[PDB]
Amino acid sequence: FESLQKQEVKNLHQRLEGQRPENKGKNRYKNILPFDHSRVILQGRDSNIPGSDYINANYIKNQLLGPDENAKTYIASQGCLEATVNDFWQMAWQENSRVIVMTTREVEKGRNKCVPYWPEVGMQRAYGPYSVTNCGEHDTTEYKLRTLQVSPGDLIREIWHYQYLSWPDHGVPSEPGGVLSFLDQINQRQESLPHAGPIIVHCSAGIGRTGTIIVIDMLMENISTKGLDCDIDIQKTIQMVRAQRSGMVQTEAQYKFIYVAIAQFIETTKKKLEVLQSQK
């Protein structure tokens, strides 16, 4: 090496992979694809079949480097296509993901959103070289906790499917905190498995409820381990996420929901200090 260093600023705006003609079916919208540089490549597939290693999903994190261990990471994903549920599990398995967030009811307003990729309760079904059994739901007001048990050679990996059904693609929740109370549980279950790889977040297209959800979570995590007094650059966080998977905070009410999300998490987590007065 040397000072000889190709300063690759924004080394990737690239998106040719999901343009391959073979992936057409593997995408739900034409303009909404994953940056080849942050795209999560399916392993196993044949080096000699067109877009074999493809999925419209991307990795994500504050920035490529920094604090704690490699700070918390997610996978922004596109709601399963019947034609692509077999390989979501390929990436879920392969990414050692152990927690899953699905922020859309399969279908909303007659318009499909995501396609089931889990078996019915007490039942099993295998998606490719993986056999998952839905061990039993836990349905809170705002969500339903499925408890799949995927299997390679029975080597049960337990994954948690948190599905949010109260936050409609046609509009952010009202004066909620159920996505905060929903993000807590999701957060403590991951806070319960270090070996746990990338949490997998997704809606359908994967750049709206998904991207919002992930940004809030990025803000709540930062304030928690750094302080409710530190700087919060939501516009900045957003572009640093869009530099990963463009579009992320897709519509008006959403960008403005990250604000309503944060400010309550901040007061909530600040009246929690009955543990202290700090009134010198």
Q: Which residues are annotated as a binding site?
A: 169, 203-209, 250
d(CA 199, CA 92): 9
Question: Which positions make up the binding site for substrate?
Answer: 169, 203-209, 250
Are the C-beta atoms of 207 and 247 separated by less than 8 Å? yes
d(CA 279, CA 171): 41
Alpha-helix runs per DSSP H in the chain: 88-94, 180-190, 209-226, 234-242, 252-255, 257-271
User: Any idea which residues carry the catalytic annotation?
Assistant: 203
d(CA 3, CA 124): 56
DSSP label at residue 70: T
d(CA 88, CA 100): 11
Nearest to 222 by CA among 269, 260, 255, 186: 269
